[PDB]
Short mmCIF file of all heavy atoms in Angstrom, two decimals:
data_model
loop_
_atom_site.label_atom_id
_atom_site.label_comp_id
_atom_site.label_asym_id
_atom_site.label_seq_id
_atom_site.Cartn_x
_atom_site.Cartn_y
_atom_site.Cartn_z
N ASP P 139 42.39 -39.56 -32.08
CA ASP P 139 43.14 -39.82 -33.30
C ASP P 139 44.35 -38.91 -33.44
O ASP P 139 45.32 -39.29 -34.10
CB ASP P 139 42.23 -39.66 -34.52
N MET P 140 44.33 -37.73 -32.82
CA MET P 140 45.44 -36.80 -32.87
C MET P 140 46.46 -37.04 -31.77
O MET P 140 47.35 -36.20 -31.59
CB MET P 140 44.93 -35.36 -32.79
CG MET P 140 44.16 -34.90 -34.01
SD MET P 140 45.15 -34.90 -35.51
CE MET P 140 46.28 -33.57 -35.14
N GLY P 141 46.36 -38.13 -31.04
CA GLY P 141 47.30 -38.42 -29.98
C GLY P 141 46.69 -38.21 -28.61
O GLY P 141 45.48 -38.03 -28.47
N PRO P 142 47.52 -38.22 -27.57
CA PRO P 142 47.02 -38.04 -26.21
C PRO P 142 46.88 -36.57 -25.83
O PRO P 142 47.37 -35.67 -26.51
CB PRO P 142 48.11 -38.70 -25.36
CG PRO P 142 48.84 -39.53 -26.30
CD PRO P 142 48.86 -38.81 -27.57
N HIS P 143 46.18 -36.35 -24.72
CA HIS P 143 45.74 -35.02 -24.32
C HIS P 143 45.64 -34.93 -22.81
O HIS P 143 45.13 -35.85 -22.17
CB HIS P 143 44.36 -34.70 -24.91
CG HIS P 143 44.31 -34.73 -26.41
ND1 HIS P 143 44.87 -33.75 -27.19
CD2 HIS P 143 43.75 -35.62 -27.26
CE1 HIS P 143 44.66 -34.03 -28.46
NE2 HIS P 143 43.99 -35.17 -28.53
N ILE P 144 46.12 -33.82 -22.23
CA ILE P 144 46.08 -33.56 -20.78
C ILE P 144 45.36 -32.23 -20.54
O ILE P 144 45.94 -31.29 -19.98
CB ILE P 144 47.47 -33.57 -20.12
CG1 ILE P 144 48.24 -34.81 -20.51
CG2 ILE P 144 47.36 -33.70 -18.58
CD1 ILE P 144 47.64 -36.11 -20.05
N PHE P 145 44.18 -32.06 -21.13
CA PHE P 145 43.38 -30.86 -20.89
C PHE P 145 43.10 -30.61 -19.41
O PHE P 145 42.85 -31.53 -18.64
CB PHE P 145 42.07 -30.95 -21.64
CG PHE P 145 42.21 -30.79 -23.10
CD1 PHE P 145 42.30 -31.89 -23.93
CD2 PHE P 145 42.28 -29.53 -23.66
CE1 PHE P 145 42.44 -31.73 -25.28
CE2 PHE P 145 42.41 -29.37 -25.01
CZ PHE P 145 42.50 -30.47 -25.82
N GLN P 146 43.14 -29.33 -19.03
CA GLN P 146 42.83 -28.84 -17.69
C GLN P 146 41.61 -27.94 -17.76
O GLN P 146 41.59 -27.01 -18.56
CB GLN P 146 43.99 -28.03 -17.13
CG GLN P 146 43.65 -27.34 -15.83
CD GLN P 146 44.70 -26.34 -15.41
OE1 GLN P 146 45.71 -26.18 -16.07
NE2 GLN P 146 44.44 -25.64 -14.32
N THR P 147 40.62 -28.18 -16.92
CA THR P 147 39.52 -27.24 -16.79
C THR P 147 39.59 -26.52 -15.46
O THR P 147 40.15 -27.02 -14.48
CB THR P 147 38.16 -27.91 -16.93
OG1 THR P 147 37.93 -28.75 -15.79
CG2 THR P 147 38.11 -28.74 -18.19
N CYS P 148 39.00 -25.34 -15.42
CA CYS P 148 39.03 -24.45 -14.28
C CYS P 148 37.62 -23.98 -13.98
O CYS P 148 36.72 -24.12 -14.82
CB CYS P 148 39.96 -23.26 -14.57
SG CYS P 148 41.68 -23.73 -14.75
N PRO P 149 37.36 -23.47 -12.77
CA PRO P 149 36.03 -22.90 -12.50
C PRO P 149 35.72 -21.67 -13.32
O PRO P 149 34.57 -21.49 -13.74
CB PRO P 149 36.10 -22.59 -11.00
CG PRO P 149 37.08 -23.55 -10.49
CD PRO P 149 38.12 -23.67 -11.53
N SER P 150 36.69 -20.80 -13.54
CA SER P 150 36.64 -19.93 -14.70
C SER P 150 36.68 -20.82 -15.93
O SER P 150 37.62 -21.59 -16.10
CB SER P 150 37.82 -18.98 -14.70
OG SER P 150 39.03 -19.71 -14.84
N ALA P 151 35.69 -20.69 -16.79
CA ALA P 151 35.44 -21.77 -17.75
C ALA P 151 36.44 -21.87 -18.88
O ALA P 151 36.11 -22.60 -19.81
CB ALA P 151 34.05 -21.61 -18.34
N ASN P 152 37.59 -21.22 -18.92
CA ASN P 152 38.54 -21.53 -19.97
C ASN P 152 39.29 -22.82 -19.65
O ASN P 152 39.36 -23.25 -18.50
CB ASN P 152 39.52 -20.38 -20.18
CG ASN P 152 40.12 -19.90 -18.89
OD1 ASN P 152 39.76 -20.37 -17.82
ND2 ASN P 152 41.08 -19.00 -18.99
N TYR P 153 39.83 -23.43 -20.69
CA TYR P 153 40.47 -24.73 -20.57
C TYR P 153 41.82 -24.69 -21.25
O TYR P 153 42.06 -23.86 -22.14
CB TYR P 153 39.59 -25.83 -21.16
CG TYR P 153 39.23 -25.64 -22.61
CD1 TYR P 153 40.00 -26.19 -23.62
CD2 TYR P 153 38.09 -24.94 -22.97
CE1 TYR P 153 39.67 -26.03 -24.94
CE2 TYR P 153 37.75 -24.77 -24.29
CZ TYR P 153 38.54 -25.32 -25.27
OH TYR P 153 38.20 -25.15 -26.58
N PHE P 154 42.70 -25.60 -20.86
CA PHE P 154 44.11 -25.51 -21.21
C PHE P 154 44.61 -26.87 -21.67
O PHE P 154 44.64 -27.82 -20.89
CB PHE P 154 44.93 -25.05 -20.01
CG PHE P 154 44.49 -23.74 -19.45
CD1 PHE P 154 43.67 -23.70 -18.34
CD2 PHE P 154 44.87 -22.56 -20.04
CE1 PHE P 154 43.25 -22.50 -17.83
CE2 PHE P 154 44.45 -21.35 -19.52
CZ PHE P 154 43.64 -21.33 -18.41
N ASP P 155 45.02 -26.95 -22.93
CA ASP P 155 45.81 -28.09 -23.37
C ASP P 155 47.19 -28.02 -22.74
O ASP P 155 47.82 -26.96 -22.72
CB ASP P 155 45.91 -28.13 -24.89
N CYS P 156 47.67 -29.14 -22.22
CA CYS P 156 48.90 -29.14 -21.45
C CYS P 156 49.85 -30.22 -21.93
O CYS P 156 49.42 -31.31 -22.31
CB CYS P 156 48.60 -29.34 -19.97
SG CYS P 156 47.67 -28.01 -19.22
N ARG P 157 51.14 -29.91 -21.91
CA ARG P 157 52.15 -30.96 -22.00
C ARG P 157 52.12 -31.82 -20.75
O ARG P 157 52.27 -33.05 -20.82
CB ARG P 157 53.53 -30.36 -22.18
CG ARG P 157 53.74 -29.65 -23.48
CD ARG P 157 55.17 -29.15 -23.58
NE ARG P 157 55.40 -28.50 -24.86
CZ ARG P 157 55.23 -27.20 -25.07
NH1 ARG P 157 54.84 -26.41 -24.09
NH2 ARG P 157 55.46 -26.69 -26.28
N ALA P 158 51.92 -31.19 -19.60
CA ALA P 158 51.82 -31.78 -18.28
C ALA P 158 51.26 -30.71 -17.37
O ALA P 158 51.51 -29.53 -17.58
CB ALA P 158 53.19 -32.25 -17.76
N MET P 159 50.50 -31.13 -16.37
CA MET P 159 49.92 -30.16 -15.45
C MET P 159 49.61 -30.84 -14.13
O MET P 159 49.15 -31.98 -14.12
CB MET P 159 48.66 -29.51 -16.03
CG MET P 159 48.01 -28.48 -15.14
SD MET P 159 49.19 -27.24 -14.61
CE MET P 159 49.59 -26.50 -16.18
N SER P 160 49.90 -30.15 -13.04
CA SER P 160 49.48 -30.56 -11.71
C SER P 160 48.63 -29.46 -11.11
O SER P 160 49.01 -28.29 -11.11
CB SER P 160 50.67 -30.84 -10.81
#
Side-chain angles (χ1 to χ4, degrees), chain P residues 140-154 156-159:
Chain P
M140 292 298 291
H143 300 287
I144 311 296
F145 288 96
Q146 172 191 358
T147 69
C148 294
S150 65
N152 49 355
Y153 58 92
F154 303 99
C156 295
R157 293 183 178 91
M159 180 53 65

